[PDB]
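#dry-run=false #mode=assembly
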Amino acid sequence: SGFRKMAFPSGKVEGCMVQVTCGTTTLNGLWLDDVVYCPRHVINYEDLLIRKSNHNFLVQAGNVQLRVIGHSMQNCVLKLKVDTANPKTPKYKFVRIQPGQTFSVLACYNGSPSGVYQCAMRPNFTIKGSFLNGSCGSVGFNIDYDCVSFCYMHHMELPTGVHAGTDLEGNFYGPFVDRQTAQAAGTDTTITVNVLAWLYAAVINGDRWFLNRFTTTLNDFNLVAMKYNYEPLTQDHVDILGPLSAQTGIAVLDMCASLKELLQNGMNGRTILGSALLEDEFTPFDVVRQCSGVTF
Amino acid sequence: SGFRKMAFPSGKVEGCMVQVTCGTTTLNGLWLDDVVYCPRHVICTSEDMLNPNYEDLLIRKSNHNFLVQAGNVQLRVIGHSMQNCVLKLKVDTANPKTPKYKFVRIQPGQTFSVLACYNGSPSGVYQCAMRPNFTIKGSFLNGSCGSVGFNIDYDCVSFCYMHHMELPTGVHAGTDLEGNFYGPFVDRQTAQAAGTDTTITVNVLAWLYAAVINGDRWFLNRFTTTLNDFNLVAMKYNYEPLTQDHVDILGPLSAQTGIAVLDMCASLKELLQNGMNGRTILGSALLEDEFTPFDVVRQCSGVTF
Ligand SMILES: CNC(=O)CN1Cc2ccc(Cl)cc2[C@H](C(=O)Nc2cncc3cc(F)ccc23)C1
Ligand SMILES: CNC(=O)CN1Cc2ccc(Cl)cc2[C@H](C(=O)Nc2cncc3cc(F)ccc23)C1
Ligand SMILES: [Cl-]
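#status=ok
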């Protein structure tokens, strides 16, 4: 029993974190094999990079200085070829995630991991992280059995306090750019498929006060979702919620009619899984995993 | 900016997790140097749990009855002893991944990270607090027994909790790494129930200071309170009494934000009276009590917004 915001064990990622210094700027890098990946803003980026030599980049792994033997840029990521392969390199992939998907973040400062938390890629492509100055280069990941799927690298904080970054190939999530200019997060929406998954988790944990005898249609429900700034629910989302629907005996449109009543009436002084708000940062897969015991 | 429930990086603890099997029971163990620490109820059957005599069950065991597995390698048990509710298995190999560590017993209100494990394999990490009623609101399934709670301030891991059981309300009970339970609980299947829980007042105040640091002041008021009057009101909402120790501990946060502890106590009094009125504090519609004053100083910036 119990339902917590759970991150993946971070150990496989801790062994890849390094400190990258270029002049006055110091941030984090990801050391995989003989390459260190870090935000290119550590340095017209091609014109600024052409003036740099390998020895201008100081890379530190624990108390050992790594020697940079080459450098190149791939989109908004700087790739530093080093003289030593990381012996702690895990099995890995670089994956680009979609809004609504969740991941773990290992927040780092000076190449030293300080904390781990779970978060989701918002529909507006920002993340509500917890980062201070020096956190740039911190990474987001998921674990699939023994393989680490790197999906995010931290680059910046927007004026509202939310965060923006890229996949490990340097492509930003969202209409953001890596430079000081007027940038703002778009109007955010609630991840509907995730709220439904969390209502199923509550039912599994013995919280059923919100269940009712009613059902609805995808058309009728999506009109309600549009009214309350909720993301549209698709047939794909309904199909993905299938296993949870069969485990609890509550049809997805049946659970949608419960969410509709929660949206139109509120919680009436009650809580669901210790929360007075409808949680949208647990995917259907996160719920199935936390209520089964999948290990890494 | 931002405020998240943050756990410590778990890597130093992952390298210590092993699987301990005794007959039909399989649970988790903590391998530090040449010793594996695990709940003593691994020697029990389900029948034994009603009124177990652990000394009588353990005397019938030999070293080779305990199967310890570290990854794909079987460790050889060369000795065993019981210390309170913990079984200590002497093994033939020291853990090369043993970090710098201490065993610390924590007080209610203190927070820690939990690395939930099954079959000696870590599945997840989350942050939680020792409730005033000595239980933890964890997320554990069958096979999680032996999972540990820890803090990693600086480079040393301070082990503070080992998971033993789930109470009928869904909350969890366990021990320090010396086998002493937190709470009036026993590793026996008897009528056991968590006492009435209360809110950790010093933690809610710390979290209100974190909101001020991050830029939010809507909840503040022009009033102050005496410490005793604050406690008379807070007790009515099931809040823990706030002591002079708690006020002293909140000193640094009070000086950083310029808001006296008793003035922050007046905002909390008002918040309890009025509710939030459709507003949130650090993305929450409830008053959070699982961030200590130390956690706030650690996570938040030194410059107030
Ligand atoms: C709010 N930041 C600023 O005014 C200065 N910034 C300008 C800037 C511009 C483009 C890019 Cl790609 C990065 C940056 C830098 C930046 O976003 N770094 C930070 C990242 N994450 C949390 C951060 C919390 C902070 F308190 C400060 C700075 C953070 C630095
Ligand atoms: C709820 N418990 C049971 O049905 C059986 N239990 C009885 C019992 C009694 C005393 C002691 Cl010290 C240990 C145990 C065992 C126990 O609590 N282990 C579990 C631990 N944590 C979460 C657990 C979730 C579960 F769903 C099952 C089992 C968990 C086994
Ligand atoms: Cl303590």
